[PDB]
Amino acid sequence: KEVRKVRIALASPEKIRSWSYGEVEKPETINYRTLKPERDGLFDERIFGPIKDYECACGKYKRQRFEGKVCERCGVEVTKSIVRRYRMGHIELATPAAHIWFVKDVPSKIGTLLDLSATELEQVLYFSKYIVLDPKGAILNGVPVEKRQLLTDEEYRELRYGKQETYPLPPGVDALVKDGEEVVKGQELAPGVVSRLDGVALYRFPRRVRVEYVKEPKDYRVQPHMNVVVPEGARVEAGDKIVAAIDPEEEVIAEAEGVVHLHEPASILVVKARVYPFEDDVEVSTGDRVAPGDVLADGGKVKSDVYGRVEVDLVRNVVRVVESYDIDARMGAEAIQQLLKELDLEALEKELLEEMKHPSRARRAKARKRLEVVRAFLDSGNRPEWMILEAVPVLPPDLRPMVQVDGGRFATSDLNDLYRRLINRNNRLKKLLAQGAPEIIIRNEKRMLQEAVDALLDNGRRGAPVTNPGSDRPLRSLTDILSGKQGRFRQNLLGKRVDYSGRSVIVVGPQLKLHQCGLPKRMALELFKPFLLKKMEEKGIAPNVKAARRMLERQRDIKDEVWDALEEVIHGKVVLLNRAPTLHRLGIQAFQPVLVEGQSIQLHPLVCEAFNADFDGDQMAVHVPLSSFAQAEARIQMLSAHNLLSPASGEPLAKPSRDIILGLYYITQVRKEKKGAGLEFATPEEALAAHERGEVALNAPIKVAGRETSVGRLKYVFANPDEALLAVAHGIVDLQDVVTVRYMGKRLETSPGRILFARIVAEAVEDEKVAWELIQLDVPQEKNSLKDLVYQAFLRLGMEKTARLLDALKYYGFTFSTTSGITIGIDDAVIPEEKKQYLEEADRKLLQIEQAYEMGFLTDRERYDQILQLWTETTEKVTQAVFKNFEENYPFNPLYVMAQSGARGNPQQIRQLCGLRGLMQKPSGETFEVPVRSSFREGLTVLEYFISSHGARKGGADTALRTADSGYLTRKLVDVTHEIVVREADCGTTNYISVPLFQPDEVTRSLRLRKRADIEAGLYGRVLAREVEVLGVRLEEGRYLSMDDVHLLIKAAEAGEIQEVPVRSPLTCQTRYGVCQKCYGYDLSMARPVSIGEAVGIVAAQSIGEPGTQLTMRTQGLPRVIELFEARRPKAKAVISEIDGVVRIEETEEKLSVFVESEGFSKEYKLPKEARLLVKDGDYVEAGQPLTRGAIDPHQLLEAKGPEAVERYLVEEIQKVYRAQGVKLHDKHIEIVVRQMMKYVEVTDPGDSRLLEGQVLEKWDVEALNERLIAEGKTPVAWKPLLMGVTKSALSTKSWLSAASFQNTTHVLTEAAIAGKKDELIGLKENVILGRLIPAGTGSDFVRFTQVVDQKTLKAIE
């Protein structure tokens, strides 16, 4: 069937063994000599499959006829060799090993279920402390031992083996205590040493034995290689041995009957034990464990009286029971696994639910967190003990290859080393266990085995990272493979390298149409090679495809008919051009290739702005969509000539630019003369007569009788534009001369340049009447006027005619800028005569300040501020003088024309060239007192150049560190809003937002109309929620607002007829997993209602983040946007009133207090002394209204006013940053992101539901749950609105695939696996990962199933 869901869960040891095709028992990879895989190794063919198709290791079966057969000689299955990428093996661990993900991922899932701290879990897991599983009646320091109690190594040994101590006696001295005498704590054993515990004292090594014969204190010396074989005070008959020896010559025997006495002990062993003498055979042996009442010896005569370990001493023929308990305490994952197997999840849930009623909030919070893990395990069907590994899966060998490079060297992955270590340590542990090694050796080996599993799963998470010997590079583990920017998700799933792709340098193609590009022939031959081979085969160029391919291999074998066939192949098709970084969707555009000679791609000038491409060495990528769907999508949706408006703002994005503006501005600007300039006459004949006498200029403004005209408007009156331009061709008049022309029945007074521009627009749109209505004739054509022309043409005519008009504007702008004569010279940077006067005034005022400062009238800080204000004022005056000089004397100056027309430059840059450089800032931030008084035309001095270099470096470093923040912000926005798609025509909601038209200004303390751009960015292309009647015009409900409607609404506001406009917005949309058509509005890229199936969430993220680099970085700029989108609490937060009432200031010398007084309530706010209060006594403040200047905490506002207020605050405060920078961005895109920020709620009262108080879930889910509970008459769930940042909102999404691929991959996957989460593949990232068709655009169910059929077939079916 079709994959619809992807589920993740824990794997049991049984499931891991079911996956595996065999156990990997050896760390061997391949044979060093034959290079064949080793049996039972990491690359075994009997486990993972054959190396080559249908061939066993022994080479007995070598063909597909024996498919699915296993050779009896070698055991290798005869099948395809690609199964080696899919077949897994496993390692059977000698001891259980915990999964590091469920241990070190805070808070630990193992620790939460078992109620163990992180430190306690590590101590048990890594064999530092024991944990009690069956106390067996053990008593520790007088207190009974209880289950789940942690024991250290010393405490465990005392309980398990008892207390004993050895005291070394000095040589020669004799012990004062006999062998087998009970001693007490502090008693002296020898003359020089004292015991520290009470117990039996035993001689360890008696250095001398003193036997007493009966007839005789004969003595015998005992040596380290001799051992006494008889007890103290034993009657030894003549002949019985006394001291044993290696050499029988030195062995000591007894001459006659006597008693043996032991003396001179090497050391005294004091052990807390009970001594039981016996006579017959003992029923127990050394090492056994006994309890009270157990028989010991003599057939029930001797019985144990206390628990402990029993040892038989044949020398002293007594039975010693060392007081100890058979306690059950274990370390490692085997102890943890036993605890997790014994948990009763049902009983644990009941206790946690009972504790959920505790009054304390911390107790309820802790119980809820434990219960959430318990609920996850209960619902998913997983078992808690599955978190400890008993079998380790082994990756297929083709995913961890050992490949031989062309040079014969072998290259292998780091996983093979990690697997080898685990196998080496596992095998060694088995050997040590089989040899009965001591506990210390076994414990160290088990600890190493646990660490080997940790390194394989996640290297470097706990302890020192594991590195390959001979280097300090950490080995790449499974966790590192799937996580990070270089992990599997971001490097191979969310993005890939593709076939049929090229790259080359771009150059400008001015001759191209808007939909065309210049593709090199040699790139096109390689890109379209499979299509070309078919075409060559079709014609006589080659007999077949393989012969055709050989022809293209050698360059000198390519004939001239191949290029003709390639021309036929590409006819109609398009390619995708892409320039990195792809900030927005206009970074990829489809063009119809034009084969060109050369090696560089030709790019249309009008698309450079969208690509952000210049021609100083940029490169672009070329992609070839292959199928009819891929071609249809590119030709219809992605074509450059179809995307003319900006998706972010709706303004034109393919519009006249630098040189085009300059050429069109030059011809549409008129001349101003000064020769006559004011003379008055009586008749026009006198006016012209003065002109031939040289008294008045052609364009000098004069007055003929009463009206103000010029000589040109009287002398030259043309019957039609053709006659006017014919006169220009003959040199009679210039394009910039103002004359009289008869156009469209009207006697116009314009220049031939402006009449020419009207014809340019008229012929491009092929409509003289409409083109006359589109242009502004009486002004020079700057950037903004041309932008308005393109937008109006798009509204009235469409993409096809606007694209034609854009090409016509490009052609004439390029033509006229070439012949106009724009050039830059050193004298074009005109120095005003006012600069010298201004600097002299600055010197005198500065000298005046210095004299005042010497007189003591002002301090250093105010002196420094006064100096800065003087130079800031002087800098502003020079800027005005620079531009006034241009507009009066040199209106056609190249620097002035470029700045005025919008072609290049701003007044700040022009001032530095012609005025003064200005003030400069130190690296610390302070400004130098002395400014740079010289411009770039005059030349800076060496010191001034160095001073200016501090700012240049600071801006350069600021830009570098700003791209990373802006790019990372965009990725956050994409990942939080990727699942938002326009999914229906109308959601049926009646809620809306009221977009204000007036802003509450505080400096005047009155309402003032907002800027037109602000209202346009909030109202354009929006559906009216309610009918509005303004200025006699009825805007009905459900009407999309165009720019004319917005302008009408602004005009009505200026007349005091409307204060706010109710519109449908994404904030109030009720559509699940997206928005509806009537709540979004227009597709701003098309100025028409948004089509169902558009990925508006991606468009919103790209629109916001694209101008992120333009935002200043230096609570302002990009940092302000980031904290607003993350809902962070500002450091210098403002103070807002929790309740509404009257303010009462109690300012005093000690402290400052603000009282919000109501009928019965009185809230006290203790403001700091340096608080810039914006409210004075006698003001009625409301809930959430600011009391201090600063940034409002979004979370405080949400709890004080509500969800609507914080949404309005977030949208407005983000838009403020973009407006201050001149970036135009619609409010829809910000509202889409904020809607995702406010997507979750928190439970306060569960009601008749299973939800827990404080549980965080989605608002849609609780609302659906609430209405269901009401349906069957049940208490609803009481919830509380919650605000979270984009990062937290994205990581708490319902799909684990999209969340895992974003950030916190280990944390996202560990929670998803335990809950058994099932991913429904709703958004865009999940479908991209699986390679499916995204549920947006042409992959959306609204349009995906459309059928096309012609009439004749339709009747045949009917």
Ligand X SMILES: C[C@H](CCC(=O)NCCC[N+](C)(C)C[C@H](O)CS(=O)(=O)O)[C@H]1CC[C@H]2[C@@H]3[C@H](O)C[C@@H]4C[C@H](O)CC[C@]4(C)[C@H]3C[C@H](O)[C@]12C
Partner DNA sequence: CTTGACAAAAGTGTTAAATTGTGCTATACTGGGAGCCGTCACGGATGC
Partner DNA sequence: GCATCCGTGAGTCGAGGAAGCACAATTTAACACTTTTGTCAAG
- Identify residues 286-345 at the interface with another protein (CB under 8 A): 286-289, 311-312, 314, 326, 330
- The region of 467-475, 695-703, 1020-1028, 1338-1346 touching another protein under the rule CB under 8 A is 467-475
Which 3 state secondary structure label does DSSP give 2? Answer: coil
Residue 1035 or 1075 having the CB closest to Zn ion: 1075
Report what 618 binds from Zn ion, Mg ion, DNA, none; CB cut-off 5-8 Å by kind.
Mg ion
74 annotated ligand binder? yes
- The region of 482-490, 527-535, 667-675, 772-780 touching DNA under the rule CB under 7 A is 482-490
Report what 119 binds from DNA, Zn ion, another protein, none; CB cut-off 5-8 Å by kind.
DNA
Indicate whether 947 belongs to the interface with another protein (CB under 8 A).
yes
- Identify residues 383-442 at the interface with another protein (CB under 8 A): 401-403, 405, 408-414, 416-417, 420, 424-425, 428, 431-433, 435-441
> Residue 907: CB partners within 8 Å, gap ≥ 6?
879, 882, 883, 899
Distance CA 701, CA 672 (A): 8
Residue 105 or 737 having the CB closest to another protein: 105
Report what 807 binds from Mg ion, ligand X, another protein, none; CB cut-off 5-8 Å by kind.
ligand X
- CA-based torsion, 653, 658, 664, 665: positive or negative: positive
- Give me the half-sphere count of Cα atoms (radius 13 Å) on the Cβ side of residue 188: 6
Q: By rule CB under 7 A, what count of residues binds DNA?
A: 44
- The region of 28-36, 267-275, 340-348, 602-610 touching DNA under the rule CB under 7 A is 28-36
- The region of 340-348, 867-875, 1078-1086, 1091-1099 touching Zn ion under the rule CB under 5 A is 1078-1086
Indicate whether 44 belongs to the interface with another protein (CB under 8 A).
no
Indicate whether 461 belongs to the interface with DNA (CB under 7 A).
yes
The correct pick among 25, 763, 1213, 1263 for binding ligand X (CB under 6 A) is 763
Break positions in the chain: residue before each gap, C to N over 2.5 angstroms:
215, 1114
Distance CA 285, CA 598 (A): 98
Residues written for the chain: 1358
Indicate whether 486 belongs to the interface with another protein (CB under 8 A).
yes
Q: Is the Cβ–Cβ distance between 794 and 900 less than 8 Å?
A: no
DSSP β-ladder status, 575-578 and 619-623: antiparallel
Q: Tokens 């684990």 — which residue?
A: 1296
Residue 775: Cβ within 10 Å count: 22
Render 399-461 in DSSP notation, one character per residue.
GS-EEEPTTS-EEE-HHHHHHHHHHHHHHHHHHHHHTT--HHHHHHHHHHHHHHHHHHHSTTS
- Identify residues 113-152 at the interface with another protein (CB under 8 A): 126-128
Q: By rule CB under 6 A, what count of residues binds ligand X?
A: 4
Q: Which helix (H) or strand (E) holds 70?
A: strand 69-70
Q: Tokens 């019957």 — which residue?
A: 719
Indicate whether 64 belongs to the interface with another protein (CB under 8 A).
yes
Q: Is the Cβ–Cβ distance between 1236 and 980 less than 8 Å?
A: yes
CB of 815 to ligand X, least distance (A): 8
Amino acid at 1095: A
Q: State CA 831 to chain mean position distance.
A: 51
Q: Is the Cβ–Cβ distance between 504 and 621 less than 8 Å?
A: no
**Taking Cα atoms as reference points, which of 1193, 1297, 1303, 1198 lies closest to residue 1240?**
1198
CB of 840 to another protein, least distance (A): 16
The correct pick among 152, 360, 468, 999 for binding another protein (CB under 8 A) is 468
The correct pick among 393, 474, 484, 905 for binding DNA (CB under 7 A) is 484
- Identify residues 1116-1145 at the interface with DNA (CB under 7 A): 1123, 1126, 1128
> Residue 455: CB partners within 8 Å, gap ≥ 6?
418, 421, 466, 475, 477
Tokens of 592: 């119809």
Amino acid at 607: V
Indicate whether 855 belongs to the interface with DNA (CB under 7 A).
no
- Identify residues 114-143 at the interface with DNA (CB under 7 A): 117-119
DSSP state of 469: T
> Residue 1343: CB partners within 8 Å, gap ≥ 6?
1092, 1093
Strand partners, 322: 273, 309
DSSP β-ladder status, 295-297 and 267-271: unpaired
618 annotated ligand binder? yes
Tokens of 1226: 């619609």
- The region of 113-121, 386-394, 996-1004, 1146-1154 touching DNA under the rule CB under 7 A is 113-121
For 521-575, what is the HEC assignment? HHHHHHHCHHHHHHHHHHCCCCCCHHHHHHHHHCHHHCCCHHHHHHHHHCCCCCE
- The region of 235-243, 468-476, 838-846, 1333-1341 touching another protein under the rule CB under 8 A is 468-476
Which 3 state secondary structure label does DSSP give 1126? Answer: coil
The correct pick among 283, 782, 979, 1094 for binding another protein (CB under 8 A) is 283
CB of 944 to DNA, least distance (A): 27
Residue 451 or 1014 having the CB closest to DNA: 451
Encoded one letter per residue, x for contact with ligand X by CB under 6 A and - for no contact, window 800-829 reads: -------xx--x------------------
Distance CA 148, CA 336 (A): 10
Residue 108: Cβ within 10 Å count: 22
Report what 614 binds from another protein, DNA, Mg ion, none; CB cut-off 5-8 Å by kind.
Mg ion
- Identify residues 633-672 at the interface with another protein (CB under 8 A): none
517 annotated ligand binder? no
Residue 417 or 1014 having the CB closest to another protein: 417
Q: Is the Cβ–Cβ distance between 940 and 910 less than 8 Å?
A: no
- The region of 513-521, 929-937, 1050-1058, 1143-1151 touching another protein under the rule CB under 8 A is 929-937
The correct pick among 139, 545, 580, 824 for binding another protein (CB under 8 A) is 545
CB of 472 to DNA, least distance (A): 7
Distance CA 988, CA 994 (A): 18
Report what 205 binds from another protein, Mg ion, ligand X, none; CB cut-off 5-8 Å by kind.
another protein
- The region of 220-228, 481-489, 784-792, 1159-1167 touching DNA under the rule CB under 7 A is 481-489
CB of 1068 to Zn ion, least distance (A): 7
DSSP state of 23: B
- Identify residues 867-896 at the interface with DNA (CB under 7 A): none
Instruction: Supply φ then ψ for residue 1344, to 5 degrees.
Output: -70, -30
Distance CA 1348, CA 1351 (A): 10
Residue 184 or 957 having the CB closest to another protein: 957
Tokens of 941: 């001095």
The correct pick among 1, 5, 33, 554 for binding DNA (CB under 7 A) is 33
- Identify residues 960-1019 at the interface with DNA (CB under 7 A): 960, 963-964, 966-968, 971
Distance CA 1208, CA 1189 (A): 18
Q: Is the Cβ–Cβ distance between 1027 and 1034 less than 8 Å?
A: yes
CB of 1215 to DNA, least distance (A): 21
CB of 65 to DNA, least distance (A): 15
Positions touching DNA (CB under 7 A) are 32-34, 104, 106-107, 117-119, 369, 405-407, 409, 411, 461-462, 472, 483-485, 495, 497, 503, 580-581, 621, 960, 963-964, 966-968, 971, 1123, 1126, 1128, 1285, 1288, 1303-1307
Q: Please give the annotated binding residues, written as ranges.
A: 56, 58, 71, 74, 614, 616, 618, 987, 1069, 1076, 1079
Positions touching ligand X (CB under 6 A) are 763, 807-808, 811
Positions touching Zn ion (CB under 5 A) are 56, 58, 60, 71, 73-74, 987, 1069, 1071, 1076, 1079
Q: Please give the annotated binding residues for Mg(2+), written as ranges.
A: 614, 616, 618
